[PDB]
């Protein structure tokens, strides 16, 4: 499936993922896209701070959903 991530510069990046992908997996994809080390990444979805060990599905993150990097 596909989700979007807003960077600290307002840039929108597109990620191909799956419902079971963990937030840690997503941070690795963001690192590849933008070069940001995972430990410097903090993600938010619908006002929820996302934990590395939980999955997109766990957070109700759907197709075409947008996540925020802070």
Distance between CA atoms of residues 38 and 49, nearest Å = 15
**CB-wise, 21 or 43, nearer to Zn ion?**
21
Is the Cα torsion angle 18, 26, 12, 16 positive or negative in sign?
negative
Is there binding between residue 21 and Zn ion (CB under 5 A)?
yes
Is there binding between residue 27 and Zn ion (CB under 5 A)?
no
Of the CA atoms within 13 Å of residue 16, those in its CB half-sphere come to 0
Q: What is the pattern of x (binds Zn ion, CB under 5 A) and - over residues 31-70? A: ----------------------------------------
Q: Footprint of Zn ion on this chain (CB under 5 A)?
A: 18, 21, 25
């Amino acid at each position: 499936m596909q989700i979007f991530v807003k960077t600290l510069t307002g840039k929108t990046i597109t990620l191909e993922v799956e419902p079971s992908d963990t937030i840690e997996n997503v941070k690795a994809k963001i690192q590849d896209k933008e070069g940001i080390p995972p430990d410097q990444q903090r993600l938010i979805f619908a006002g929820k701070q996302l934990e590395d060990g939980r999955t997109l599905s766990d957070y109700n993150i759907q197709k075409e959903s947008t996540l925020h990097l802070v």
